[PDB]
């Protein structure tokens, strides 16, 4: 593997996608990088709202497993055949790897109009793979077949393309220190949030509220999704801290835009260090969570029915190291996360964890 060749290998607020060549001869697809799922799933049939798809009949090396997979959720669905084929990633590798592949033949609201990508690369753990955890994940195939370490890292530069470095850490994608937080459970990239701070003022909440259901790092979620109680506290704190006349109720919930930066507060998320007595904060400036769409803006944070999702809103500010080998998630500030000659994110530490509980994940 060549880590320098993986710099700028993603194309981008509708997702970051990697060019992947599938089958014999190779068919070029554009595949969404998703750290919150574990299946390699692509478009199989000729569907509306997409340019191209993976035709299994054109691949001589394709082999069907003889079974289907179905994923159920509230706002849609997708069904596909499970098979096996050779895959290469041009920007990073120069040899093919045998992987599992789901080919989507029917789906509800999956492929949206005006989206460039036509599949998803699930980079989370075997636990989440469908129909079961025995279906070898793409990254597990890659680690084993490509002789790379069990580590990848991701940088998103949309707010400033991006980079998915498969096998390690590229030193040119960051400056300063990498801070590591432990992976509490290996399914999603679940990490422990200790505190949320708005304009230097902590939310007066139990730290279990941040990890109610789970707190995860997900490149396949657009916004910073917060549980309803945490979301209402953040909105109240941002509204109070903001100098201006109040934002509308519709702005907070995402129904309407705000049209027209020192007037808006910083938002910091404290994460436990590998030493449990210490923590570090990942901080986003207003430029990351008041997102351009008279210039009109949308609120980059949304309410969640279940989990606290550290989505693209936050990941845009940081080079994120998914160190599966050492059971930890690294964070460093992205040099590309810069607008109008000003850094739109910060990282700092250490901070004490003496006031907070030893385990903020409920059990």
């Amino acid at each position: 593997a060549n880590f320098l060749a993986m710099v700028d290998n993603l194309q981008g607020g509708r997702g970051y996608y990697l060019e992947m060549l599938i089958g014999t001869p190779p068919q070029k697809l554009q595949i969404l990088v998703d750290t919150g799922s574990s299946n390699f799933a692509v478009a199989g049939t000729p569907h509306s709202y997409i340019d191209t798809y993976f035709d299994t009949e054109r691949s001589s090396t394709y082999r069907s497993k003889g079974f289907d997979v179905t994923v159920k959720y509230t706002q849609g669905s997708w069904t596909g055949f499970v098979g096996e084929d050779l895959v290469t990633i041009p920007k990073g590798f120069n040899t093919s790897f045998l992987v599992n592949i789901a080919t989507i033949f029917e789906s509800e609201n999956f492929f949206l109009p005006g989206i460039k990508w036509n599949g998803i690369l699930g980079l989370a753990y075997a636990t989440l793979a469908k129909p079961s955890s025995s279906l070898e994940t793409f990254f597990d195939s890659l680690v084993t077949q490509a002789n790379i370490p069990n580590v990848f890292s991701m940088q998103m530069c949309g707010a400033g393309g991006g980079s998915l470095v498969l096998g390690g850490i590229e030193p040119s994608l960051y400056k300063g220190d990498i801070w590591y937080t432990p992976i509490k459970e290996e399914w999603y990239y679940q990490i422990e949030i200790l505190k949320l701070e708005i304009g230097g003022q902590s939310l007066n909440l139990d730290c279990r509220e941040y990890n109610a259901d789970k707190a995860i790092v997900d490149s396949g979620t657009t916004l910073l999704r917060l549980p309803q109680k945490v979301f209402d506290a953040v909105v109240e704190a941002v509204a109070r801290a903001s100098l201006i006349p109040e934002f509308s109720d519709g702005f907070w919930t995402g129904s309407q835009l705000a049209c027209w930066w020192s007037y808006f507060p910083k938002i910091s998320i404290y994460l436990r260090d590998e030493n449990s007595s210490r923590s570090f904060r990942i901080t986003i400036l207003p430029q990351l969570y008041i997102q351009p769409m008279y210039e009109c803006y949308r609120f980059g944070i949304s309410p969640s029915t279940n989990a606290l999702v550290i989505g693209a809103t936050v990941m845009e500010g940081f080079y994120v190291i998914f160190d599966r080998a050492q059971k930890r998630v690294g964070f460093a500030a992205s040099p590309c996360a810069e607008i109008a000659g000003a850094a739109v994110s910060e990282i700092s530490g250490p901070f004490s964890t003496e006031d907070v509980a030893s385990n903020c994940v409920p059990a």
Epitope: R63, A126, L135, T137, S141
Partner: nanobody
Framework: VQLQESGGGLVQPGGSLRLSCAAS????????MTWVRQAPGKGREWVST????????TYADSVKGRFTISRDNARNTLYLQMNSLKPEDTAVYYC?????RGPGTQVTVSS
């Protein structure tokens, strides 16, 4: 996903072994199977991968022409036929599938 390797041993240069790996606790007939090797003080090295039906096989350039991967889905067994062995082939050979691995079998080649 339970895996247990066997068939390794001490051989001469130009020798031969036939590794096996018994599988249980999962649908072996639907699983991609891969042999990996690891020697002390050396990097982890992929040997060969075989698809679930056995028709698609891939090999590392270091073993191409000399080693052959195969499987018996009816018997839940993966194989590696090893020919023309040399001292550089000395390692623990283990089978892996879906992020799990077996403890492996020692292959030693020496004069």
């Amino acid at each position: 996903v339970q895996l247990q390797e066997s068939g390794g041993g001490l051989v001469q240069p130009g020798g031969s072994l036939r590794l096996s790996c018994a599988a249980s606790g999962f649908t072996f007939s639907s699983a991609i199977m891969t042999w990996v090797r690891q020697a002390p003080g050396k990097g982890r090295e992929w040997v060969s991968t075989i698809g679930s039906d056995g028709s698609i096989t891939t090999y590392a350039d270091s073993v191409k022409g000399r080693f052959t991967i195969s499987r018996d889905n009816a018997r839940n067994t993966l194989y590696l036929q090893m020919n023309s062995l040399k001292p550089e082939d000395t390692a623990v050979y283990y089978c892996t599938s879906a992020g799990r691995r077996g403890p492996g079998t020692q292959v030693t080649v020496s004069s």
